[PDB]
Design a binder for this molecule. Structure first.
Ligand code: AGS
Lengths: 189, 144
């Protein structure tokens, strides 16, 4: 799978080259050898529609907004480029319900990043924290991303300190502050 | 028996070097006529182009076309109109195989590499294997 992050910034000249890649897979090397990559998947991303997604016209992107985005795309890339795209997809605005689901997922990832069993949550507050985080991360302007900041700033930074202070051995708990904080299990042990 | 200027030598040279036009083929129906029909069968519309190519190709028959000029076309038009599909179909007819067309990746060009990747370079430069797209093909495929 090829991934071209922020294709809108790529100079049109390279996109011109991508035209070969995107049709018949005949991207060739500098030395004249043909690659033949028709078996691959090519994904490119961009922010061209931001000015219209920011119209806030629904969660599922509504009509008109989608069309204005298409407009931005057409005004940015040459038609020959766009014509070689199998599908142009516009992502949806991450609604509160999406945020709740996202929070569940992100918290799981945090556990997956825990290489050792001294970094482990029971978490608790599966409704309270979930709600807190969901409300605070519900911002169209950053998509799902501020959730990463919420978790770090409200949960992990504090955890780091609790670890340094030996206030945790394993099986951590998050507590509600009128904000969030962590339980002291052992205490400077 | 003997060596016939046409039926023996012209045809012999063609067997050796390629060059269908010197095979002095018995049929311009199963070489030109069918060309227009089949190119038209697969490429819808652009009949004008099909005929332009077929006729340019027609002139090469028996070597009538200018000894120093390749049949040559420039295809302009709406993308999605078969600007390269026709070319493949022409190869599809000429070599009875669309994949025999030599594609030149012009999409990637800079005056500092643009010629060299086609024709390669001179001695003293990293890598000789000259001819990426043109020299290395044209040396072996005279009527590609
Ligand atoms: N007149 C036609 N009849 C049948 N199929 C066609 C016709 N024109 C286009 N197509 C189809 O649509 C595509 C046309 O391809 P191309 O000739 O590359 O389009 P194009 O205009 O060459 O794209 P660019 O960017 O100008 S190469 C092919 O994949 C064909 O399947």
């Amino acid at each position: 799978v090829l991934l071209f992050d922020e294709v809108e910034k790529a100079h049109p000249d390279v996109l011109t080259v991508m035209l070969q890649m995107l049709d018949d897979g005949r991207i060739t090397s500098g030395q004249g050898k043909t690659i033949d990559c028709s078996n691959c998947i090519v994904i490119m991303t961009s922010n061209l529609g931001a000015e219209f997604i920011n119209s806030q016209q629904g969660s599922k992107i509504q009509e008109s907004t989608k069309n204005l985005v298409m407009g931005a795309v057409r005004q940015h890339f040459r038609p020959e480029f766009l014509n070689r795209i199998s599908s142009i997809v516009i992502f949806n605005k991450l609604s509160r319900k999406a945020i709740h689901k996202i929070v569940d997922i992100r918290l799981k990832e945090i556990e997956e990043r825990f290489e050792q069993n001294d970094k482990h949550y029971k978490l608790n507050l599966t409704q309270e924290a979930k709600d807190f985080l969901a409300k605070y991360g519900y911002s169209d302007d950053m998509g799902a991303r501020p959730l990463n900041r919420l978790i770090q700033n409200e949960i992990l930074n504090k955890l780091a300190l609790r670890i340094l202070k030996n206030e945790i051995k394993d099986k951590e708990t998050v507590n509600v502050v009128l904000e969030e904080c962590l339980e002291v299990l052992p205490n400077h042990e | 028996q003997n060596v016939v200027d046409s039926d023996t030598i012209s045809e012999t040279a063609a067997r050796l070097t390629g060059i269908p036009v010197k095979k002095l083929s018995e049929s311009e129906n199963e070489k030109l006529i069918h060309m227009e029909r089949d190119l038209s069968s697969e490429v819808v519309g652009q009949m004008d182009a099909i005929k332009a190519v077929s006729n340019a190709v027609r002139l090469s028959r028996s070597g009538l076309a200018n000894p120093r000029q390749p049949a040559s076309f420039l295809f302009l038009g709406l993308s999605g109109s078969g600007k390269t599909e026709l070319a493949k179909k022409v190869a599809g007819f000429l070599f009875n195989d669309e994949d025999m067309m030599i594609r030149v990746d012009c999409s990637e060009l800079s005056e500092k590499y643009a010629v060299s990747k086609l024709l390669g370079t001179t001695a003293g430069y990293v890598g000789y294997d000259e001819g990426g797209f043109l020299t290395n093909q044209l040396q072996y495929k005279p009527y590609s």
